[PDB]
Amino acid sequence: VHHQKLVFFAGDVGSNKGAIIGLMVGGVV
Amino acid sequence: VHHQKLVFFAGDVGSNKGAIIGLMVGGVV
Amino acid sequence: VHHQKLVFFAGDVGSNKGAIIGLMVGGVV
Amino acid sequence: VHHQKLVFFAGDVGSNKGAIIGLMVGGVV
Amino acid sequence: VHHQKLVFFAGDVGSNKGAIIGLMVGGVV
Amino acid sequence: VHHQKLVFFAGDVGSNKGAIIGLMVGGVV
Amino acid sequence: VHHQKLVFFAGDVGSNKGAIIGLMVGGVV
Amino acid sequence: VHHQKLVFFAGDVGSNKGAIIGLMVGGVV
Amino acid sequence: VHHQKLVFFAGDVGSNKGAIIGLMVGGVV
Amino acid sequence: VHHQKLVFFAGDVGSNKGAIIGLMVGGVV
């Protein structure tokens, strides 16, 4: 009705369900 | 009705369900 | 009605359900 | 009615249900 | 009705379900 | 002398000198 | 002398001097 | 002398001097 | 002298001096 | 002298000085 707009997000936005590692160092030095 | 707008977020926004590690160091030194 | 707007958040916003670790160091030194 | 706006938050905002650790150090030194 | 538009997102947007590693170093030095 | 081992930590171990914040929510609702 | 081992840590081990934030939510709702 | 081993760490091991953020949500809803 | 080994780390090992962010969501909804 | 080995690391090993981001979502919904 006179320029109406709707946006539907049926799922998650920006979700994490696994692993996020910024830095990983391993050694047997 | 005269430029109406609706936004629906059916899920989580910016949710964490796993693991977030910024830094991980391991050693057997 | 004359430029009305509604926003719906059906889920959590910025929620944590897992683990968030900033720093993790392990050693057998 | 003449530029009305409503925002709905059906869930938690900024909630923690898991573990948040800032720093974690372990050793067998 | 007079230039109406709708956008549907039936799935997740920007979700992670695996592993994201920024940096990974390993050594037997 | 017959399997002698020494470990020296010249600095702090698992210490905080900055800011550690677990959760932060801000709004201008 | 007969399998002697020494380990020297001249710096901090697993220490924080910056900012560690677990979760941050901001809005101008 | 008969299998002697020494390990020297002149710097920090697994330390943070910058910013580590686990999750960040921002909006102008 | 009879299989002697030395390892020298002149710098930081697994340290952060910049920014590590696990997840970021921004919107002008 | 009888199989002597030395390893020298003049710089950082597995360190971050820039930006590491795991996930980023932005929108003008």
CB distance F2–G7 less than 8 Å?
Answer: no
Instruction: Provide the terminal-to-terminal Cα distance of chain J, rounded to the nearest Å.
Output: 70
Contact flag for D and C (3+ C-beta pairs < 8 Å)? yes
Inspect the interface and report whether the beta carbons of C22 and H16 lie closer than 8 Å. Answer: yes
Q: Which 8-state DSSP code applies to residue H11? A: S
**Which candidate, H27, B13, E8, places its Cα nearest to that of A15?**
B13
Tokens of E19: 């592993």
Neighbours of F14 (CB within 10 A): 17
Q: Which pair of structure tokens corresponds to residue B24?
A: 């991980």
Lookup result for tokens 């962010």: I21
CA distance I24 to B12: 14
Residue I16 contacts B where some CB pair is shorter than 8 Å: yes
Q: Are D10 and C13 in contact (CB under 8 A)?
A: no
What are φ and ψ of residue D2, in 5° steps?
Answer: 60, 65
Technique employed here was cryo-EM
Tell me the one-letter amino acid at G4.
Answer: Q
Closest residue of chain E to J13, computed from CA coordinates? E25
Looking at chain A, which residue has its C-alpha nearest residue J6?
A29
Please classify residue E21 by burial: count the beta carbons closer than 10 Å to its beta carbon, then call 0-12 exposed, 13-18 middle and 19+ buried.
Answer: middle
Q: Which residues of D touch H22 (CB under 8 A)?
A: 20
- C11 with D9: CB under 8 angstroms? no
H26 contacts chain D (CB < 8 A): no
- Whether residue F16 and residue D23 make contact (CB cut-off 8 A), yes or no, is yes
Q: What percent of chain E is helix, strand and coil (3-state, nearest 5)?
A: 0, 50, 50
Which phi and psi (to 5°) does residue H15 adopt?
-110, 155
Query: Could you tell me which chain G residue has the CA closest to the CA of H8?
Result: G8
The upper half-sphere exposure of residue B4, i.e. CA atoms within 13 Å in the direction of its Cβ, equals: 14
Contact: chain I with chain H (3+ CB pairs below 8 Å): yes
G20: which 2 tokens? 């560690």
Final resolution, Å: 2.5
Beta pairing partners, F20: G20
